[PDB]
């Protein structure tokens, strides 16, 4: 009955994570920063009692065998949660994440209209990138949900774990969870071409084999969605090419020039109001000039090409996005400057 | 049990640096660099085993008997924490014990340049602190961790073998996992670290292939990762990390390294010209756009050329540039500066201009 | 009675100054004196004899281990006599054994024929000192004399890693810890993995078998410690080349730079039969690095180091092998054939004789 | 399929190694099915295919056609190829030349008077 109250406080306060460890009060991450609750500090008896209060008997066994445990659980009327229990300095510790279920609209997410146009693409590779917790899964869920609403096609997702659930609308939606429904990303992608897909979500471009799978899907007539942890379009494109040996990079660059349809690099920044976060996003939509630049190995010039395609194609550099957020007073100058990849350009952009 | 308490108490009270326990000698304490025997009868093999085992857990006893080697740390309430090494010689247990101070020195007390303070403010990336064993790496890391703890409202996780410096919660939540007790291994701790909502992670030495991938993944997914190696320069550090991997996977490591590297600090402690104490010599590499491309393009030899002229703007500093400054302040001798220069000819050119 | 024979055979080995006792079937017991085997005046042994004699000095666990593998290395003491290193094996279906003497008494520098510059090496605060030569060329005896001088004079921590431990060093002014590979520590690599956490001042690492041991020895010497190691090389230049050339070409520049800073002495030894026909006398090449030699190492001009050694005798206590053979020849300790048979350049030694 | 006339003449070769290469989904299996079907139609020989998985089925025409699917009919390419010389083949499809062992099987089949078909993921004759 105490663990219930703590998870209730986490939800009510709009927090993302609950942390339980000795010699500190419970702490909740809100808008990316930890805030301690107005409670006495926990001891080792407390952390074990609190964490064990949400475990099954079999789960207590596995944790004591390894001093590690991953799990998920639900609290009726509240939310499901992702938990990790571990041991530090001889005492139990726990971290508990909230599992969103409701898909927000493109405008609630702060996504510009061009992202809505990406859900209509018949084939190609669309990459959504950024750091952990930069909105990638929510953006993807909005795109996938629009396809589910609008098309009569087959969507297959491979996820680790599944985050957002897509009940069938006009599409048939099959969602495979790594570690339960399928052994691995590699095994799921081995059979995906024999599963008659139209739209496939493959997750992060972790290694060479998954990149070849996404390029093959995109060039064989499918719309393929994937993620990377990179922070810009140029940085994203380089990270796909540079994984391959020098001798095979020309083909990958040629493949990317044909199948790439969009790169979205996101980051959530604290709002100037002090409550909540706002999306900063760089949007690159390839035009003929950029596709040629990829093939000719002149990737360093793509940023300059993005600078002049805003009105026509819906492109937007990070700095142009930061410029709009600064003009609307959604973020502070220090936050905007802190994320600008070129503060001198943004300063020029602000005073021009 | 209550005897080992007394020997460690005498070690601290007497200002010793190290306590030595071995057979056919009384306990000896190193004072001002030289060993002094305590006024006690010589120890036998029963004594050394009992004394060393009195400060061990059952897990630690088993692991020592499995390997005949053991590093560990422990605390004596009201006195101090200590680092221990237990080993076997001539069929008998032996032990050496160092003191671990409660107070973490500041960047200025440690002789660290202002760029090290700015590394403690990095919101993401990979920072490497390198050098041989006992070259000051843990002391520098403790200063960095403590500043983040003071200044940020974030989650710091350390995996250590063993834990040396303890970081009670300040503004951060700090969790410290000791290998062999809190967690089975580095591999196991890093397998779950990504589900523990960390912001800053200390992973220890990049001792094998699997830990580097864990450290690279942590750094590229938006976390600040600190790690150590045994190397003496930025180029040796960068080369050592990529080349340990099979040739076909080095491209990904180079792309990853070019993206996540935020600083490499290579340290060595040198004797002070006064003859008492040591002074820090440090090579600092801070990646600029030019350097990140060279890592990505497998042009490591050109990384060194970029470092000689970026000193004033970003706080970068080659070892030779640091040695030049130590020589100008007359903190070190010519033999020491030349004896640690990776290119004495370059240092000669800087001196005679 | 079997034990009483093994004791008498091992006692005879010590009183007659033999180095090794050999027991095998169809031969009498034989003892090695000054490198050459001599049979004792006894009937030849059979398989019953060799098994009983060798087993008389083994523990029950050692007999069991021997019977599982047909191999056994061990050390043991005979109260009032000496300690010994034994190996028992099987040949032609019968037990055989070899037993070496481990002397209790370390001889002094002058008794061993070591020049005074070797005494000064025991006073070095840090660096790498290499003692090289073939098997049984006196390397361990020289190292024990140096370590004994450190043990006597300093209040520091000496750690040895040995395969196996030969000379035992009681604590004198130093604290001496000696780790035997295969019993005290799993391997040289594992012992060296922890040596920096054991607060050493002086470390003996044994033979520079592999890259990891060379890197460990260079690190010890770079971090302010005095490190002793051995190789099987016959000259200073050959020794330096052996260390550098085991590394890949791309990392050899650093090794040469490292060696040039930390190297403090190279001793290459060989024991030669005396002219009188009894005993052996030490011939030694001694290299003590000066600023000129350290540069030759960094510049990859290794083979030019010998010319520097020819002229550093009076100033730095240096000495080439040929300079040593000259002194043994003028004092008539060795014959002309023995001295010439070992000169790396007999024509140079010839010129030194006629001058 | 848009294959030039020289491809039909390759289907008449009595022996040797024929490689059909390209990236995934570039038509390789379809081209190979056209070649095998002509052989099945034209020859009185024994065709064995090893496939992971089987993509095109060939009912017997003038040839005897045996098709082994990895993971069901046979444990692996390695296991199927160890016995193929003892199965009296004339034409063999071995799939992708993924490792050194499979290449040696294809070169040996092609050298001992058999017609061997295999694929690679290379993009040109020289690269292949
Ligand atoms: N564009 C966005 N605008 C507003 N809130 C967002 C946005 N994206 C994500 N969020 C919220 O912040 C959290 C982080 O999003 P997430 O899907 O986990 O990104 P990632 O998968 O990259 O970690 C989400 O749970 C969501 O509630
Ligand atoms: N810049 C420094 N100035 C003075 N003392 C230092 C300095 N750096 C390290 N030390 C001292 O060195 C000793 C051991 O350092 P340590 O953390 O073990 O380095 P490492 O783990 O890399 O070998 C510590 O007691 C520390 O006080
Ligand atoms: N300089 C020396 N002078 C006289 N006798 C020596 C000398 N060095 C060694 N001896 C004797 O010769 C024997 C063989 O030498 P040893 O220590 O086995 O050399 P190594 O270390 O190369 O194996 C020793 O037992 C020792 O008693
Ligand atoms: N010459 C061709 N012309 C048009 N479509 C083709 C052709 N060859 C194959 N296809 C179709 O393209 C898809 C992929 O071809 P596939 O035979 O699977 O090539 P691969 O075995 O190299 O991956 C198939 O489903 C097929 O129907």
Author numbering:
A (entry chain C): 2 to 353
B (entry chain B): 1 to 353
C (entry chain A): -1 to 353
D (entry chain D): 110 to 237
Task: Quote what the paper states about this structure.
PilT is the PilT/VirB11-like ATPase that powers T4aP depolymerisation. PilB is the ATPase that powers pilin polymerization in the T4aP. T4aP polymers can be rapidly depolymerized at the base, resulting in fiber retraction. Adjacent packing units adopt one of two conformations: open (O) or closed (C).
Therefore, to crystallize PilTGm in the absence of added nucleotide without reductive methylation, we extensively optimized the buffer (see the “Methods” section). The resulting crystals diffracted to 3.0 Å, and the structure was solved by molecular replacement with the entire hexamer present in the asymmetric unit. This structure was approximately C3 symmetric with alternating open- and closed interfaces, similar to the methylated OCOCOC PilT structure. However, small deviations make this structure pseudo-C3 symmetric. Although a nucleotide was not added, density consistent with ADP allowed the nucleotide with partial occupancy to be modeled in all nucleotide-binding sites. These nucleotides were likely carried over from Escherichia coli during protein purification. The isomorphic low-occupancy and high-occupancy ADP OCOCOC PilT structures have an RMSDCα of 0.6 Å per hexamer. The RMSDCα of these two structures with the methylated OCOCOC PilT structure is 1.9 Å per hexamer. In the ADP-bound OCOCOC PilTGm structures, the estimated occupancy of ADP was similar in the open- and closed interfaces. The three OCOCOC PilT structures described here are the only examples of PilT in this conformation determined to date.
